[PDB]
Amino acid sequence: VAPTHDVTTDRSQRLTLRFVPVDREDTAYSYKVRFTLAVGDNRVLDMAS
Amino acid sequence: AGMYGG
């Protein structure tokens, strides 16, 4: 009877969030990125996915 | 549980 009291929401949030780089480089043998991933006040990220 | 899915 899988329950409905405060599991999944109405408040219109996304499910996958692709992030896009800064720190785009090139090297003869290396490459770098960095991502200011923002998540925000709620919607806790599980970090394995 | 005999069911096509959860």
Binding site: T16, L17, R34, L37, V39, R43, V44 | -
Partner: protein, 97 residues
Amino acid sequence: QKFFAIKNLLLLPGSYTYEWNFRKDVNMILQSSLGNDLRVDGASVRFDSINLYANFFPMAHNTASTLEAMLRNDTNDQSFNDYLCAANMLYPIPSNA
């Protein structure tokens, strides 16, 4: 993404800078069959664009805030273990020793 601290972490929200150094060295990003000892044959890579992804579970904003304001503590805190959990020492053995 295999680093043991950030492998199965639970990430309470904020804004988090997340850097990565990839490797463009064609020798140990590829793999031969016959021991084709590369970087002299002509193999190379080129990276167009590298993007992140994530997957938020949608929790209710009253029950995420009873996770988040309960996980933010001094005793409710994550702790991971390396599996192999060791330290290689890497001793050389010269020719026929």
